[PDB]
Amino acid sequence: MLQPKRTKFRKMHKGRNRGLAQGTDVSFGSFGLKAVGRGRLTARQIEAARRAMTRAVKRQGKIWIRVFPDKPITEKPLAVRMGKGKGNVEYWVALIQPGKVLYEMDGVPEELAREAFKLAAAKLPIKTTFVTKTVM
Amino acid sequence: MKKDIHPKYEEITASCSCGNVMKIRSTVGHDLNLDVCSKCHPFFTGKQGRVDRFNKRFNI
Amino acid sequence: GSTRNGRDSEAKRLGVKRFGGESVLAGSIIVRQRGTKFHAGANVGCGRDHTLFAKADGKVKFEVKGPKNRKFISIEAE
């Protein structure tokens, strides 16, 4: 479960998630799972997808996680009246814009990479596609 | 040099027992009688086995 | 539930009071600032809270000058 070791501040504003993403190319490995929809990726979701990939490939090849959940999300408990302070931090998300290469993989044939990325795309909450490294 | 704050520093004579006489400004006041200098120290001049001792003690 | 926050200070109303090209009288404040974000040029004085005031009549003139590229305010005499 990914989380920053320390941050300057514990709570952040909600903010907005407009625009299209940077880091949209396959940079290190040969194949990539790229997000086409827009949303948030919980650290639990990222972990579940990574576990599914690594188990599908059986620990050959190399896997890069190109996103990191650095934004804390708060929640209020039940039976708490609205308005008495910002709530407590519960989990961390990574905001995703379209075209954002979430995961990336090398050292494995294309069909096995496609199958592993299919299992992880089934674990993720947003729309994805499979992309290949292109020379320029 | 500042005045009146520095120690008295006048020229004296140092004689070493190897026959050496030298003159230096120094703060000790009286003359100096030296046991060794740079001209008679063995390091400066250049003055600085089991089978052997076994053979010497048990020559046959 | 209770918060440790909730305090703020009343805003000091800083910023450029008379802008570039405006005609001023003697003694008019041009900017109010914390520190010399802008420096005083010709016919502009720096008061103790680093406030730049027009030392003579004329028009305000903003410029950049110097080896550190610092922003100066001058009064060009009319």
């Binding site: - | 500042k2 704050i5 520095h6 120690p7 520093y9 140092a14 030298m22 230096i24 400004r25 120094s26 703060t27 000790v28 100096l32 030296l34 046991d35 060794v36 200098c37 740079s38 120290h41 390091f43 400066f44 600085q48 | -």
Partner: protein, 177 residues
């Protein structure tokens, strides 16, 4: 003045022949000699620092600067601005006379002397050494001492490299081992 005249007449010629220089200004000079004493037990007894100042003054023929702490240190329980050492700087005539005193008298009087390390250059040609017992200087009489002390000596030189610095000191016949 004796070793300074010795420098001017033969050491510059020796270094010219040795290193194929083009300028007598390029031939290295001995710039200064700095003597320092770390008297860090002044925090317990400040008067002992005054004793060490009198000691260094008698050795070098010059009133010393009482050096204080650059910044406060946790382990040694010193505060910034607190006097913990003393230092003299020797330039010119007094530097040459002290250098002669050292290399002729005080160095042969070292207990168990086998020579000085040739690795004691700071990578730039400057030399540093330590004196364990100030009694090696004849300026300090024996039965007037209260505590055995030491000091350290830094010959700062305008030479560019370690080879040049050790060549200069060897041309002055500095007892390297």
């Amino acid at each position: 003045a004796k070793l300074h005249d010795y420098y001017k007449d033969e050491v510059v010629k020796k270094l010219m022949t040795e290193f194929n220089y083009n300028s007598v200004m390029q031939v290295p000079r001995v710039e200064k000699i700095t003597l320092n004493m770390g008297v860090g037990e002044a925090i317990a007894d400040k008067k002992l620092l005054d004793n060490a100042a009198a000691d260094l003054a008698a050795i070098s023929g010059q009133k010393p600067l009482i050096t204080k702490a650059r910044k406060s240190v946790a382990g040694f329980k010193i505060r910034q601005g607190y006097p913990i050492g003393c230092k003299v700087t020797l330039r010119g005539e007094r530097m040459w006379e002290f250098f002669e005193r050292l290399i002729t008298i005080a160095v042969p009087r070292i207990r168990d002397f086998r020579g000085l390390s040739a690795k004691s250059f700071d990578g730039r040609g400057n030399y540093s050494m330590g004196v364990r017992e100030q009694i090696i200087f004849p300026e300090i009489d024996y039965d007037k001492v209260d505590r055995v002390r030491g000091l350290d000596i830094t010959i700062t030189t305008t030479a560019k490299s370690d080879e040049e610095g050790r060549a200069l000191l060897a041309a002055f016949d500095f007892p390297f081992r």
